[PDB]
Amino acid sequence: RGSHMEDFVRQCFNPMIVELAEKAMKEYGEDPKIETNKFAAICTHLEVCFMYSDGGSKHRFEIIEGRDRIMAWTVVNSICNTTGVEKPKFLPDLYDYKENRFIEIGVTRREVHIYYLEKANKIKSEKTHIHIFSFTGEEMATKADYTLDEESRARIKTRLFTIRQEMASRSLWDSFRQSE
Amino acid sequence: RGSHMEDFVRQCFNPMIVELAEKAMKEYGEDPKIETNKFAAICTHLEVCFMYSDGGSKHRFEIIEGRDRIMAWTVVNSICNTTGVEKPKFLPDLYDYKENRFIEIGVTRREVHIYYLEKANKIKSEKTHIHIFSFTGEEMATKADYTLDEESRARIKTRLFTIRQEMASRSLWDSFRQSE
Amino acid sequence: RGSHMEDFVRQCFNPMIVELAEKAMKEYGEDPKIETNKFAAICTHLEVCFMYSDGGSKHRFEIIEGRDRIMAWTVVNSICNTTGVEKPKFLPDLYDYKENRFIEIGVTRREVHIYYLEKANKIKSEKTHIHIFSFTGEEMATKADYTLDEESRARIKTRLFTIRQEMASRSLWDSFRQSE
Amino acid sequence: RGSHMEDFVRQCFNPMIVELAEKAMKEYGEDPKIETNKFAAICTHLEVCFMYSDGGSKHRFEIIEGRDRIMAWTVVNSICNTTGVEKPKFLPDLYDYKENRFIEIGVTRREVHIYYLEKANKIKSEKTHIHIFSFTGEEMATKADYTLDEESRARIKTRLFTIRQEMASRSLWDSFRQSE
Amino acid sequence: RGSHMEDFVRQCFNPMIVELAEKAMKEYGEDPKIETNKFAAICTHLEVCFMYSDGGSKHRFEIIEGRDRIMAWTVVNSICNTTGVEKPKFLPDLYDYKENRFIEIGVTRREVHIYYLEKANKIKSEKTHIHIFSFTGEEMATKADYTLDEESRARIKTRLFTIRQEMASRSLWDSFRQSE
Amino acid sequence: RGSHMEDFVRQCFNPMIVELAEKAMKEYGEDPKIETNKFAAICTHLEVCFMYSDGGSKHRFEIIEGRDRIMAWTVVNSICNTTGVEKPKFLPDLYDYKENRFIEIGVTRREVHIYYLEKANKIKSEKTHIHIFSFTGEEMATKADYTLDEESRARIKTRLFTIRQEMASRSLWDSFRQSE
Amino acid sequence: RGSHMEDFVRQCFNPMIVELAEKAMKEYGEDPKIETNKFAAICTHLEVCFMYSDGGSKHRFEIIEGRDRIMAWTVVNSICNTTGVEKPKFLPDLYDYKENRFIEIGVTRREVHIYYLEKANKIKSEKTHIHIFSFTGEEMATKADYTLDEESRARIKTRLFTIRQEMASRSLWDSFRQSE
Amino acid sequence: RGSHMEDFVRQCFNPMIVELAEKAMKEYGEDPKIETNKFAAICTHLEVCFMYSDGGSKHRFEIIEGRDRIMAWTVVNSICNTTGVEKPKFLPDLYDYKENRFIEIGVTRREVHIYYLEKANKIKSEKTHIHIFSFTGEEMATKADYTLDEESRARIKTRLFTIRQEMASRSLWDSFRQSE
């Protein structure tokens, strides 16, 4: 195939992140060698999810994203059958042991307002918290509750804009934006 | 022997946990290859004990469980001869340097109410704190003092229900429950 | 799913071997959680291939098995376009830099005579060397040329019979044999 | 070349620090083998920058110094395009996610009063925070805001005076002072 | 020589601790193979010093003990020439960046009251803080200021009584006590 | 218990060797804390077995000693069912893939002539090769076939005499000799 | 800059190789970010040099390439002043302790005949051995003496053709060939 | 002290070598901080001894140099009491299990002829093999038997001349030569 995007994704993200995004796509019948613009998105979404859980206390979050589909639903059941939160219809990204809610992390190339509206329409669970990030530096969260401290969220926005700059420096950003 | 339980225990728990539970059973004349349902219990009890001490401050707990019988009693003596707490009749699991008391950790497959009553009858030391966990997500502690924060205890309950789900997914949970 | 085979495969083989066999099946639309008898075969075939290359000199073999389908064909092309050997129709397992030939490694649960005959009918390349191993301790190679020393091949047969014993000790061998 | 300074710098500083200072000089057309007094300064400035970021919270600082010139400006842009701080004219050393400002770290062999005055004249950005350290144990910061706790800044002053003592013990301090 | 004490010291303490105590004795013309009772004391004193600095914040303490005689005095000078504290007459064990004072750590086999009185008579520096521990579980500190939290000091007392029990279990404690 | 032997064994042998000898004794109902003279023998026998297999080629030997009783018999069966050698009545120490025979390694504190005669009377398998070492530097092997090169066997004799010297230097050798 | 070549070079070669080629170019006033086609050549030449020394015995070769210019000439002097070989006019790549000669390794994108002729004209040292490799699988060496075994040289040719295939798969080979 | 030699020795030799030479001098009442020219010699002698044993087979040599005085004599006794070689009067450097003799390694700054004559006069053991190296590239061995292959000895001579060049590049060689 030989995509400049694919080689950039392998140089941009940590090797363990690339491996999980590969397993995530293959589990859903997708090839990172051809769906390279996607490939960059699951890597980006995975890193943001891991930096998100890195914020806060040690035992605060339970990481759902990055596990296999069967195991992620197993941990979701264990969380629901121990706390009492209703089972979400779709797989969330994290669970906040401090606020007692599931968190859906979103990373958008378009306006934060549109994605969240698209995400909120999907999740009929209602109780699931939504937190959206953009590649321009904006963010949007449910009830204006941004969960983490400002410094942890600012670190995520900075990294997102760095991925955007490195992509545009290789003339790959325009195709990345016009693909979501 | 070739027990599905034994292979599940080795896949479910961290290798160091399995090694300590093996040494614990062998020290008391028990073979994990035949007493597989037990084998899963010492592993579960060991992990809960280690996640428990992982909660709280750095120097808060002294881990008694997981040591050899002679060395565990040596540390118990050192704690008693330095603080002044009475020597317990039976080996506890942890010592809380913050609350100045020994902690007995229990993990039950039956109702939390029965196990604690069974545990409290045994410990005539009285001063020893009891903290029970169940595979269904409930917990019971002495004087309603649960020692740790809610997030640390919720992480233990979630892991316990995951072990239950993985066991039932292999048709091994029913024999595990009807063996305590 | 919860298969005793799946847990045995994870306990029997080295973790890196299990990961490569997982990626190998998923690349060809197969799930190790349901195709557990297969899952044990790619792991077994992978280990035999790696012990095979472990025999002989340092730079003797080029390992084709265990790579992704695209990369394995890239190395096959490089070997053909540098030595002059004809491109095989199917992906082989190794290349012998000493004998200047590709090697197809086979591991059979049935009689070695049948598998090799089945393998030789497939490879019209003719030049590709075939080396078959069985779980009973027999082996068969092209032109009676067994490539490696007797000690290296004996180590492979011993390991194969150990996998057979561990499988039969868990009542999983009968289903493994009646599935090839 | 064979400079006593060069061998002292390699023995005094951590190997990773020496490698970054080497790459920093070579990127700007300087050879650490001849510009040995300089070589000791970029190493010293690099370590102080890393101990500075080591103070405070986990996600507090973004380390600009120690990166390549192109990548450091990329992170500066990402910070400016996400928070809104004006782009500084010169490359700073850190960014404080807590106070929302860039920090310029200075290490002087002369009086702290002169260096800061020289530094403040250069940075027309105004918003950039300046923090100066000396090899005698004094420090000077903008608006008397020293950012970190006293213990973290005291650790930096102690290390600086140790470098001075080790240098003077080798008769290399006098040439180091008369070279800034 | 073949001393039971020497083999116990190597089994009781961490290997890095044993190496530093060896270098400490040899620097002062002492052989751990014959002065085995001493050998156990520098190891004990070294571990207590390291557990002491392990208490408190990250940048709180500067470890003087465990360095070579020349380097320890270099760091003492740097601390004195940066904070302003008077140079102590004898080498202390730690410096408290929080309380701005040097700390002398003592471990006694006799009554805590006698050792501290012996230590206080030696240090004419006056400003140096003294903190004594005993193998029986008692402690004594200057101005009743024990610097660390109760849990960190209780961990040190517990370890000291464990060393006493292991020594007495080998009939080596009586000679250890009658040698200070 | 507090045995000088036990502390010497932990200081003399590599930690992994001590762990295997511990598991070996406990599997056969023996406590290394009281049976200390024995404890030194399984450690010595284990190291000699590992240095023995270290001699020769890479795939030459299959290590039977050091495995659990069930797994060692599994590998013995695999070797017998693949080569054709008769199943030995007692567990041997190694299998020689080069000479096609099992090897029984013996380490004696008495005369090599007596032990081998005692060993040969036990093994009715006849085909099993016997190789005896002594703590004085002598050795005896079946059919005068010493399997390995002279340098590898000389390294084993040297190590054995070093263990003897270290034991006698602690007045533990006399009890060690009068206990076989 | 954002070159597809630069990202491919970082994905194709081992990270340590990329670091040495970076230091090699910067030492000679070249930037791998703009001279990307070159950047791929020093990486390729470096790997071939390291695989070359990997062939043969343990102490056979002394690696000159990959060191700094000053240190490489130091080792060249030591080799000349100990064996007696004349000092070469230009820095070679290796020294063969077996054949007692320096080796110049060449990797060409054009015909092997032209490069060697260009190389031989440069080296007036005459005694220096020349060994050329091409990306098509051919090789040329002085006096038809190819130094290493066929398997080691075949491994180098295979890797070279793999780099060519990966480059052409990204449409970067044509610019790579038309740049030597 | 601050010696350019001391800093060069720490930069020139591997850290483990420097630590052993430090322990070797301190065991004999010598300080590497003042006896810096010596300090460079024990490091040089230690490395040559380790490269010497690195030549030849795996179990060929027993390394005597680099151990403590008591332990080195213990291994010497074990070698003498197992092979039968007479106990040497002075501590040798290695034992050759292949040739059955002790080896004394010498490194001279003067003529090889003088040192060996000085060494041979000392060793009345006669059976001990002597092998001398010089910093100019010459060597001298007993009975013209140089033990190792030419390539292994040539690697030692090359390293010795590199140490000489690095020393002379720092104006430290002249004092090093005029101190033996």
Ligand SMILES: COc1cc(CCNC(=O)c2nc(-c3ccccc3C)[nH]c(=O)c2O)ccc1O
């Ligand atoms: C759809 O196929 C895949 C499925 C998974 C696992 C489940 N998906 C998520 O969890 C998830 N996916 C996305 C996402 C990413 C790229 C394109 C489209 C979307 C919608 N954005 C999230 O925020 C999120 O949480 C992983 C990779 C895939 O390619």
Ligand SMILES: COc1cc(CCNC(=O)c2nc(-c3ccccc3C)[nH]c(=O)c2O)ccc1O
């Ligand atoms: C009984 O034999 C063993 C003894 C030990 C060490 C001492 N036991 C405990 O500390 C302990 N045991 C249990 C426990 C676990 C399984 C079945 C029955 C019980 C009662 N539950 C605890 O809560 C606890 O603290 C370890 C493993 C054994 O199999």
Ligand SMILES: COc1cc(CCNC(=O)c2nc(-c3ccccc3C)[nH]c(=O)c2O)ccc1O
């Ligand atoms: C078929 O789907 C898969 C394909 C691959 C990669 C290509 N296959 C081989 O290379 C290969 N496969 C087998 C094999 C293994 C199990 C069942 C059936 C067979 C026929 N036996 C070989 O000897 C061999 O060389 C890996 C795992 C798969 O499940």
Ligand SMILES: COc1cc(CCNC(=O)c2nc(-c3ccccc3C)[nH]c(=O)c2O)ccc1O
């Ligand atoms: C000038 O050439 C180099 C440039 C860099 C990168 C950019 N420079 C800094 O960031 C920087 N330099 C200095 C500095 C250090 C030594 C002498 C003179 C000065 C002025 N003091 C800082 O405080 C600082 O922030 C690194 C090493 C160089 O040699």
Ligand SMILES: COc1cc(CCNC(=O)c2nc(-c3ccccc3C)[nH]c(=O)c2O)ccc1O
């Ligand atoms: C005296 O010779 C040695 C000197 C040092 C370094 C300086 N000494 C201390 O720092 C120090 N020594 C002791 C100490 C320990 C054992 C016996 C007697 C005493 C008095 N108790 C401390 O509290 C302390 O701080 C180390 C080991 C020695 O053997």
Ligand SMILES: COc1cc(CCNC(=O)c2nc(-c3ccccc3C)[nH]c(=O)c2O)ccc1O
């Ligand atoms: C007997 O109980 C134990 C059993 C094992 C495993 C099986 N035993 C051997 O394999 C084995 N034992 C011995 C041996 C060692 C000490 C005392 C007596 C003897 C006779 N000498 C061998 O040469 C040998 O091969 C390990 C440790 C034990 O304590």
Ligand SMILES: COc1cc(CCNC(=O)c2nc(-c3ccccc3C)[nH]c(=O)c2O)ccc1O
């Ligand atoms: C003399 O004091 C020390 C003793 C030792 C251990 C025993 N010495 C040797 O083994 C040894 N010494 C030397 C040597 C080295 C420097 C100056 C003088 C000499 C004569 N040359 C050898 O060849 C050798 O074998 C180590 C370091 C010392 O400083």
Ligand SMILES: [Mn+2]
């Ligand atoms: Mn998700």
Ligand SMILES: [Mn+2]
């Ligand atoms: Mn999401």
Ligand SMILES: [Mn+2]
């Ligand atoms: Mn317990």
Ligand SMILES: [Mn+2]
């Ligand atoms: Mn319990």
Ligand SMILES: [Mn+2]
């Ligand atoms: Mn295949």
Ligand SMILES: [Mn+2]
């Ligand atoms: Mn195959």
Ligand SMILES: [Mn+2]
């Ligand atoms: Mn800067």
Ligand SMILES: [Mn+2]
């Ligand atoms: Mn600065």
Ligand SMILES: [Mn+2]
């Ligand atoms: Mn002290």
